[PDB]
């Protein structure tokens with residue numbers, strides 16, 4: 143069938159530690175001899191509205207950072223800040239370090255989240271970067287420093303580190319170079335996410351998946367132009383579909399024989415009619431958290 | 442805040458997955474101490490005489506890029522136990538358990554000894570699971586983690602025509618009325634897991650999705666007569682007491698929430714969603730909702 147699978151979390155579990163600074167404890171990512179964690183681990187609650195992190199970090203000494211992997215304590219021998227991520231240099235390389243790289247992902251892209259509390263992982267789930275650069279995750283207090291990743295062969299690509307929960311209940315974070323996804327800042331001042339839209343190219347990939355698994359009830363005889371489609375789909379809060387999106391789908395189009403702009407016409411009709419009580423691949427809603435790359439891997 | 446289908450972290454189980462090959466067939470095996478566990482249909486039907494002709498060296502056992510010499514074999518129900526020359530140094534604290542319909546577990550899907558994805562499943566009332574499997578997945582395993590102890594509960598044996606999957610516990614007993622043979626087999630008519638739907642409505646409330654709540658209450662009998670009408674599972678008194686912790690953390694008594702559910706069963710949702718779903722979700726247990734939404 144088609145289930146939203148996460149990646150096996152084992153390679154990431156071996157990297158999670160807890161980082162303590164004063165009364166603050168959150169999770170860090172231990173790779174080689176560096177521990178990475180959100181820089182607000184150094185913050186007090188009075189500084190939260192307008193923290194001066196450079197001013198706060200220059201006042202800290204290595205021995206102020208208690209880093210703990212399992213039962214073991216790690217000695218911090220250096221520290222530096224990169225954008226919104228703090229990098230704590232430690233005196234012993236992590237022997238469980240996998241092959242890895244850091245990558246900045248784009249809206250529509252999917253990844254797995256290892257939700258951790260006190261450096262101990264508690265669950266893993268699949269997630270997508272929304273077009274408004276938030277993620278609809280599942281995070282409790284203490285989850286800061288949890289990370290999102292993909293696994294390709296044996297290479298863990300780290301793409302997200304969790305920093306905060308916005309007022310609307312969605313989550314905001316940075317890449318592993320500390321740059322936020324979206325217009326957010328690690329400050330407790332008012333900030334709001336742009337209106338969230340549906341990831342059109344992902345919905346289409348999911349329909350192609352439905353056709354591959356046997357389900358054709360939503361297909362119609364029509365075709366459309368790219369500009370006719372975008373004019374209709376914008377009215378439903380769908381992301382504009384670009385010629386690049388059209389190119390990304392070509393393999394699935396070839397595999398099923400339905401041209402991309404035919405499938406677009408079926409999606410136009412589905413938006414107009416709703417499900418009429420039916421389901422596609424076990425869902426009564428249009429699914430937008432499977433990329434074209436995903437569909438092919440599990441189909 | 443937020444609510445997701447969440448699996449247990451699979452690291453403790455990844456360290457136990459291996460490929461087993463008998464002739465042409467290659468499927469995944471579970472390596473604990475000095476034994477590899479896998480479905481007995483990898484020997485291919487009569488298995489008593491079929492296994493008595495296979496020698497230890499009929500079974501190629503690859504643990505990653507290393508070879509395990511099979512030095513013994515044994516069968517327990519539908520599961521093959523291959524004794525190997527050396528114990529798995531990554532063996533977690535573990536036990537074998539059998540789960541009940543309605544209970545959930547995580548699944549580590551493998552392909553040629555290679556674990557490739559993890560997802561959270563529920564044992565259906567008809568004893569099947571709606572999993573995502575492609576060829577090579579057999580012997581992929583289901584488990585729960587509690588503390589540091591892995592409870593293994595599921596080993597996958599076969600796909601079914603409906604797209605659902607059938608398998609055994611780690612002692613080789615099937616879940617449901619299925620046999621590991623090429624015979625044509627059909628899943629029984631499924632039913633919805635009522636206590637899970639209710640735990641999920643509780644998760645929706647905890648997340649601020651409150652629209653489906655109403656002033657009323659009901660009775661188990663009046664409610665249960667509407668469950669049978671909608672192909673829902675009988676709600677029992679044990680179910681109510683199990684939903685107790687959430688009943689307090691929110692102020693919604695369980696038969697109050699049942700009035701909400703009866704009223705959603707009757708009239709559906711007015712083009713509305715609950716926790717981003719257009720359907721009533723029944724794959725989260727009361728325990729699942731607690732471990733995720735409070736601590």
Ligand SMILES: Cn1cc(-c2cc(-c3cc(Cl)c(F)c(OCc4ccccc4Cl)c3)c(=O)n(-c3cccnc3)c2)c(=O)[nH]c1=O
Nearest residue numbers: 166167168182281282283284285286306307328329330331
């Ligand atoms: C000390 N401390 C702090 C945290 C921690 C900090 C935060 C957090 C971090 C930063 Cl930089 C903030 F600007 C922030 O104000 C949010 C806000 C309030 C009002 C208006 C707008 C905004 Cl944006 C919050 C957090 O959001 N969470 C969290 C909670 C629930 C789910 N996910 C994340 C947790 C922690 O986990 N451990 C630990 O010891």
